[PDB]
Design a protein around this ligand. Structure first.
Ligand SMILES: CCCCCCCCCCCCCCCCCC(=O)OC[C@H](COP(=O)([O-])OCC(O)COP(=O)([O-])OC[C@@H](COC(=O)CCCCCCCCCCCCCCCCC)OC(=O)CCCCCCCCCCCCCCCCC)OC(=O)CCCCCCCCCCCCCCCCC
Ligand SMILES: CCCCCCCCCCCCCCCCCC(=O)OC[C@H](COP(=O)([O-])OCC[N+](C)(C)C)OC(=O)CCCCCCCCCCCCCCCCC
Ligand SMILES: CCCCCCCCCCCCCCCCCC(=O)OC[C@H](COP(=O)(O)OCCN)OC(=O)CCCCCCCCCCCCCCCCC
Ligand SMILES: CCCCCCCCCCCCCC(=O)SCCNC(=O)CCNC(=O)[C@@H](O)C(C)(C)COP(=O)(O)O
Ligand code: SF4
Ligand code: SF4
Lengths: 115, 114, 112, 99, 207, 79, 178
C-alpha cells in the first residue's frame, strides 16, 4: 500500500505541476506560432513519412539478446543450488552460445548499419 | 535578322514549350495549394497562372519566349520544392498594395504622375 | 619502392617507365592524325618527344622526377593521360581552322 | 597570480605544464596606459629640393595593355613555351619536419 | 623611387611569349591577346570556343591551369554584346595566372564549363542570377543569391541600387509582403568627376 | 470501342468545364471558331480529358485536335 | 618550406612493451584522463570575468564611440558647414543643410547623423579639417526606440558639450599620431 501511495503522490505532483504550467500564464495562440518548427521555414514533408532506420538487424538482435538476458537473470538464485556443477556448465554454455551468436553477426557484418 | 536560336527555330515550338510549361503549372497548382496552407482556392491559383502567361503573351521573339519558358521552369521548380514559402507564392496576388487607378481624374487628384 | 605519393587519391603506380612509355607513344600516334600545319600537333610532338627521350634516358624514379619537373612521377603519368585525352578532343574539334567570327569593333575597347 | 602554493602545484600537475610562467591574465607587465607623446618621422619626398612630382608620379606610369595579337589590328621550328618556368619543389622543413 | 612599384619585364616577356603560344595554337577562337603593365595575361576569345579553350588550358602539358579561381561577368551596356564573361585561371604547376574573356548579350547564352571545372557550377549560377546570362548544359541552373521570387538581374547597370520592391511585415494578412520601394532618404548621387583628365595615356581620339 | 460512352463522357467534361457551352456546343463545334476559345483554354480541355480518361495526350496531337469529334475518335483509335 | 602534420617516418615495429603501452592507453582511457586533468587545472585557475557595470573593459584613446560636435574654447562651434564629412561618409548617414548665420558666419542649420545608418568608421572625424565632428568614447547609448538614434544638430551639440572633458583629453593624447 505504501509503494502505491508514493507512486500516486508522484503522479499527482507531476499532474499538479503541468496543470499549474497550463493554467498560470497568459495565452496568445495563432497559426504561425503553433506551426511546426523546421528551422524557420515551412516543412516540405509531413514528418509522418517512413524514416528507414539503418540498424534494424541490430534491433532484432537486441530483442534476442534481451531474452538471453531474461534467461541469465535468475543466476543469483541459481548459484544457491545443491548441484552447482551442472549449473556452472549450463551458465557457461549459455554465455558461450550468446557470445558465438554475437561473433557470427559481427563477422557477417550484421551490426554495421547498412545504408 | 540572322540571329542564333537558343532552343527553338521559330515560334511554333516556342509555343509548344509554352504549352508544356502551362500544363505543368496547371497540374502543380492544386498540389501547391494543398501542401502550402494557402488561403486561396484552386481556381484562383490557376487564374493567376493564366494571368501571368497572358501578361507575358505579347512577345513574338523565339529567343525571348524560350528565356521566359526557362525562367518559368525555374519558378515552377522552386514551387515544386517548398523553396518558395507562403509569402513567396502570395506575392503574385498583391493583396496588400492598392493599385494605381488608370484614369486621368484620379491620377490628377493624387500625385504628379503620368 | 615508393610507399606513398603524398596526394590523396593518387595511387603508387609501380613500373612508371612502361606506363609513361605507352602513354607518350599513344600521344604521338594520335598526333600523327593531325594536319602537318597544326601548331598544336607541332608543339605537342615537341613536348611528348622530349619527355619520352628523358624517360628513356633516366632509369631511376627519383632522378627521372627531378629531370621531368612535373611533380611526382604519378602526377606526370596523370598529366600524360590528360594530354592524350586533350589530343582526342582536339582531333574531334578543329582549332587550327581560321577565326570563326570577328568581334564588333568596340567589343574589347577599355575604357569606353 | 594570487594563488597559494598548493593550488599552484595542483594546477601545474593537473595541466601537465607550468602555468605561472605563462598565465593568461595580465597583471603588470603590460604597457602603461598613459604614454609619452610620439614624434613620427616624415618619409621620403619631404626633401624641399630635387622633389618634382613628375619624377615620382607612379600613377601616370600606367600604360594601356600591350596587344600581342589582334583579329583587327594585326589581321593575321620554334620551341614550345610555358607561362613561367615550372615551380621548384618545396624543401622539407629542418627545424621540425614532423614526418 | 620608393613610391613606385617595380616592373618585372622578365615576367612580362614570359606572359607575352605564352600569349603568342596560345594564340597560334587556337587561331579558330582567339580574337585578342594582351598583357597588361601589371603583368597579367588576358586572352579574348569567341564565345563558341569557351569549351575548347578552357579544356586546352585545363589539361595541356605546358599550360596546366587546372584550378579555376574566378568566373564573373562585367556589364558594359554600351557595346552590342553587353556582358563580358571573365575566367581567372590558376596554374599551380607553372605558378601563373591567366584571364580568358568572352562576350554575350541578353539573348545569346554561353556553353557552361561544368564539364571542365566543377566550381563553374555555382559560379555560372551566380552569373545567371546577377546578369541574366543563360548557360547551356548547366545542371540545375537557377538562382543562387537573390530572393526566391525576385524579378530582374540586379548586378546589371540598368537595375536600380535599391531595387523595385521592398519587404515589410503586414499584420492584416499576417505575412511578409512586398511593396513598391519608397525611400525615406533618397540616396544622393554625387558627381565626383573632375572636369580635367588625369591620365593622358588613356586619352581617347575625338569622334 | 464504347463510342457512345466516349462521346457522352467527353460531352460531360465539356458541360462541366464551367466557362463555355450555354447550349451552344455541337459534336462538330470548333473551339477557336464557334466556342470562341484560345490555346490555353484548349489545353485546359485536353488536361481535363487526361484527368477523366486516365491516359496522357502529348502536345503534338493536342495542337492538331480541334473539336470534340476528334477528341472522341482519337480516344477511340488510341483505345 | 613545408612540414607534415599526420605523416609518420618509418615505423616503431611491434614490441611487447610498446604493445602493452598501447593496450593500457586504450583500456585505461589515458588521454581521456589527461583531458580531465586539463579542465581540472582550468577549474582551479582564476576566471577572467570582470564585474561588468562596475569594472568596465579596457579601451584606447582612438576608440570610436558616439558622435559629437565640438566647440572652440571661446564657445563658438567648430563646424564650418563644409560637408566633406558627408561627402566621405560611406553610409550617407550625414545631412548638412546650411546657410549664413545672422553674423554672416558659415554655419549649419541641419546636421543630422543617422546612427542606425552609420557604420562607426571614423571617416568623418578623420576628414574634418577643424576637428568639429568627433567620435567620442560613449558606447552605452542604446535606446528603446528607433527614432532616438536619429540624431540632429541639437543632439550632437549636446553630446559635444557633455563629453568635452573626455574628448579633448583623448584628442590631446592622440593627435600626434594623426
Ligand atoms: C566561499 C565564499 C564565501 C567567502 C568569500 C570570501 O570572503 O572570500 C575572500 C577570500 C578569497 O579572496 P582572495 O584573497 O581573492 O583569494 C585568495 C586566493 O586568491 C585564492 O586562491 P587559491 O585557490 O590559491 O586559495 C584557495 C585556498 C582556500 O580555499 C578554501 O579555504 C576553500 C575551502 C577548502 C576546503 O585553498 C587552499 O588553501 C587549499 C584547499 C585545498 C582543497 C582540496 O578568502 C576565502 O575565500 C577563504 C576561503 C573560504 C572558504 C569557505 C568554505 C565554506 C563556504 C560556505 C559553505 C556553506
Ligand atoms: C517553481 C514552482 C512554482 C511555479 C509556479 C509559480 C508560482 C508563483 C506565481 C506567482 C505569480 C502568479 C501570477 C502570475 C501571472 C503571470 C501571467 C500574467 O502576468 O498575466 C497577466 C494577465 C493580465 O490579464 P489582462 O486582463 O491584462 O488581459 C490579458 C490580455 N491582454 C493583456 C492582451 C489584454 O493575467 C493576470 O493578471 C492574471 C493574474 C492571476 C494571478 C493568480 C495568483
Ligand atoms: C567461445 C567464443 C566466445 C568467447 C567470449 C568472447 C566473446 C567475443 C565476441 C566477439 C568476437 C568477434 C571476433 C571476430 C570478429 O568479428 O572480429 C572483427 C574484428 C574486426 O572488426 P572491426 O574491429 O570492426 O574492424 C573494422 C575494420 N578494421 O577483428 C579483429 O579485430 C581481429 C581480431 C583478431 C584477434 C582476436 C582475439 C584473439 C585472442 C586470443 C587470446 C588467447 C589467450
Ligand atoms: C500560384 C501562382 C503562381 C503563378 C506562377 C506563374 C508562372 C509564370 C510563368 C511565365 C511563363 C510565360 O508566361 S511564357 C508564355 C509567353 N509566351 C508567348 O508570348 C509566346 C506567344 N504567345 C502567344 O501567342 C499567346 O497568344 C498564347 C495565348 C500563349 C498562344 O496562343 P495562340 O493560339 O493565340
Ligand atoms: S563614422 Fe563613418 S559611417 Fe559613421 S557618420 Fe562618420 S563617416 Fe559616416
Ligand atoms: S563637421 Fe567638419 S567635415 Fe563636417 S561639415 Fe562640419 S567642418 Fe566640414
Amino acid at each position: 500500500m505504501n509503494l502505491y501511495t508514493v507512486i500516486f503522490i508522484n503522479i499527482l505532483l507531476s499532474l499538479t505541476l503541468i496543470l499549474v504550467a497550463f493554467w498560470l500564464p497568459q495565452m496568445n495562440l495563432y497559426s504561425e506560432k503553433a506551426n511546426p518548427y523546421e528551422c524557420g521555414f515551412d516543412p516540405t514533408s509531413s514528418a509522418r513519412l517512413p524514416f528507414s532506420m539503418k540498424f534494424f538487424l541490430v534491433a532484432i538482435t537486441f530483442l534476442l539478446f534481451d531474452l538471453e538476458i531474461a534467461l541469465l537473470l535468475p543466476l543469483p538464485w541459481a548459484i544457491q543450488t545443491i548441484k552447482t556443477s551442472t549449473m556452472m556448465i549450463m551458465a557457461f554454455i549459455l554465455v558461450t552460445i550468446l557470445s558465438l551468436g554475437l561473433a557470427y553477426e559481427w563477422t557477417q557484418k550484421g551490426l554495421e548499419w547498412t545504408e | 535578322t540572322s540571329v542564333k536560336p537558343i532552343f527553338s527555330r521559330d515560334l511554333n515550338e516556342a509555343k509548344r514549350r509554352v504549352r508544356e510549361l502551362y500544363r505543368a503549372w496547371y497540374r502543380e497548382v492544386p498540389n501547391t495549394v494543398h501542401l502550402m496552407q494557402l488561403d486561396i482556392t484552386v481556381k484562383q491559383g490557376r487564374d493567376k497562372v493564366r494571368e501571368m502567361f497572358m501578361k507575358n503573351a505579347h512577345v513574338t521573339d523565339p529567343r525571348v519566349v524560350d528565356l521566359l519558358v526557362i525562367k518559368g521552369k525555374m519558378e515552377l521548380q522552386e514551387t515544386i520544392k517548398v523553396w518558395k514559402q507562403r509569402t513567396h507564392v502570395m506575392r503574385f496576388f498583391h493583396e496588400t498594395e492598392t493599385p494605381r487607378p488608370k484614369d486621368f481624374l484620379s491620377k490628377f487628384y493624387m500625385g504628379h504622375d503620368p | 619502392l615508393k610507399k606513398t605519393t603524398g596526394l590523396v587519391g593518387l595511387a603508387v603506380c609501380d613500373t612508371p617507365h612502361e606506363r609513361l612509355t605507352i602513354l607518350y607513344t599513344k600521344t604521338l600516334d594520335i598526333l600523327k592524325h593531325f594536319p602537318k600545319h597544326a601548331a598544336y600537333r607541332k608543339y605537342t610532338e615537341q613536348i611528348t618527344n622530349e619527355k619520352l627521350d628523358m624517360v628513356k634516358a633516366e632509369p631511376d624514379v627519383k632522378k627521372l622526377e627531378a629531370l621531368l619537373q612535373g611533380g611526382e612521377v604519378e602526377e606526370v603519368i596523370l598529366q600524360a593521360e590528360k594530354e592524350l585525352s586533350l589530343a582526342r578532343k582536339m582531333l574531334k574539334w578543329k582549332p587550327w581552322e581560321p577565326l570563326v567570327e570577328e568581334p564588333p569593333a568596340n567589343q574589347w575597347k577599355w575604357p569606353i | 597570480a594570487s594563488a597559494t602554493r598548493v593550488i599552484q602545484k595542483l594546477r601545474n600537475w593537473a595541466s601537465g605544464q607550468d602555468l605561472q610562467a605563462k598565465l593568461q591574465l595580465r597583471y603588470q607587465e603590460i604597457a602603461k596606459r598613459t604614454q609619452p607623446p610620439p614624434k613620427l618621422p616624415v618619409g621620403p619626398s619631404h626633401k624641399l629640393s630635387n622633389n618634382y612630382y613628375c619624377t615620382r608620379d607612379g600613377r601616370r606610369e600606367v600604360v594601356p595593355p600591350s596587344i600581342i595579337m589582334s583579329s583587327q589590328k594585326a589581321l593575321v621550328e620554334k620551341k614550345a613555351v610555358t607561362p613561367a618556368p615550372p615551380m621548384k619543389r618545396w624543401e622539407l622543413s629542418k627545424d621540425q619536419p614532423y614526418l | 623611387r620608393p613610391t613606385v612599384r617595380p616592373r618585372s619585364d622578365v615576367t612580362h616577356k614570359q606572359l607575352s611569349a605564352f600569349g603568342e603560344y596560345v594564340a597560334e595554337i587556337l587561331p579558330k577562337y582567339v580574337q585578342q591577346v594582351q598583357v597588361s603593365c601589371l603583368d597579367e595575361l588576358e586572352i579574348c576569345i569567341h564565345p563558341d570556343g569557351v569549351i575548347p579553350t578552357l579544356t586546352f588550358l585545363r589539361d595541356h602539358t605546358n599550360a596546366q591551369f587546372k584550378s579555376l579561381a574566378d568566373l564573373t561577368a562585367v556589364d558594359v551596356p554600351t557595346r552590342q554584346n553587353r556582358f563580358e564573361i571573365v575566367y581567372n585561371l590558376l596554374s599551380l604547376r607553372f605558378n601563373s595566372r591567366i584571364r580568358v574573356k568572352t562576350y554575350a548579350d541578353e539573348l545569346t547564352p554561353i556553353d557552361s564549363i561544368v564539364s571542365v571545372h566543377i566550381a563553374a557550377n555555382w559560379y555560372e549560377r551566380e552569373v545567371w542570377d546577377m546578369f541574366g546570362v543563360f548557360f547551356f548544359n548547366h545542371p540545375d541552373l537557377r538562382r543562387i543569391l537573390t530572393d526566391y521570387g525576385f524579378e530582374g538581374h540586379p548586378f546589371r547597370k540598368d537595375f536600380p541600387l535599391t531595387g523595385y520592391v521592398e519587404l515589410r511585415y503586414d499584420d492584416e494578412v499576417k505575412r511578409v509582403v512586398a511593396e513598391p520601394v519608397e525611400l525615406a532618404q533618397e540616396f544622393r548621387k554625387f558627381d565626383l568627376n573632375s572636369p580635367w583628365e588625369a591620365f593622358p595615356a588613356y586619352r581617347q581620339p575625338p569622334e | 470501342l464504347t463510342l457512345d460512352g466516349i462521346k457522352d463522357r467527353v460531352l460531360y467534361v465539356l458541360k462541366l468545364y464551367d466557362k463555355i457551352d450555354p447550349e451552344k456546343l455541337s459534336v462538330n463545334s470548333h473551339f477557336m471558331k464557334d466556342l470562341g476559345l484560345d490555346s490555353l483554354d484548349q489545353v485546359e480541355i485536353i488536361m481535363a480529358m487526361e484527368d477523366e480518361f486516365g491516359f496522357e495526350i502529348p502536345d503534338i496531337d493536342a495542337e492538331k485536335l480541334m473539336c470534340p469529334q476528334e477528341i472522341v475518335d482519337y480516344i477511340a483509335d488510341k483505345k | 618550406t613545408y612540414k607534415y602534420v599526420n605523416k609518420k617516418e618509418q615505423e616503431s615495429e611491434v614490441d611487447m612493451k610498446s604493445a602493452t603501452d598501447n593496450a593500457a592507453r586504450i583500456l585505461m582511457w589515458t588521454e581521456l584522463i589527461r583531458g580531465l586533468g586539463m579542465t581540472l587545472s582550468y577549474l582551479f585557475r582564476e576566471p577572467a570575468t570582470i564585474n561588468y557595470p562596475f569594472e568596465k573593459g579596457p579601451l584606447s584613446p582612438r576608440f570610436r564611440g558616439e558622435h559629437a560636435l565640438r566647440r572652440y574654447p571661446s564657445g563658438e562651434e567648430r563646424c564650418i558647414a563644409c560637408k566633406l564629412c558627408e561627402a566621405i561618409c560611406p553610409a550617407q548617414a550625414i545631412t548638412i543643410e546650411a546657410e549664413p548665420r545672422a553674423d554672416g558666419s558659415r554655419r549649419t542649420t541641419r546636421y543630422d547623423i543617422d546612427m542606425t545608418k552609420c557604420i562607426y568608421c571614423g571617416f568623418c572625424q578623420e576628414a574634418c579639417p577643424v576637428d568639429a565632428i568627433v567620435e567620442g568614447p560613449n558606447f552605452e547609448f542604446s535606446t528603446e526606440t528607433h527614432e532616438e538614434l536619429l540624431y540632429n544638430k541639437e543632439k550632437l551639440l549636446n553630446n559635444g558639450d557633455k563629453w568635452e572633458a573626455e574628448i579633448a583629453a583623448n584628442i590631446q593624447a592622440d593627435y600626434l599620431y594623426r
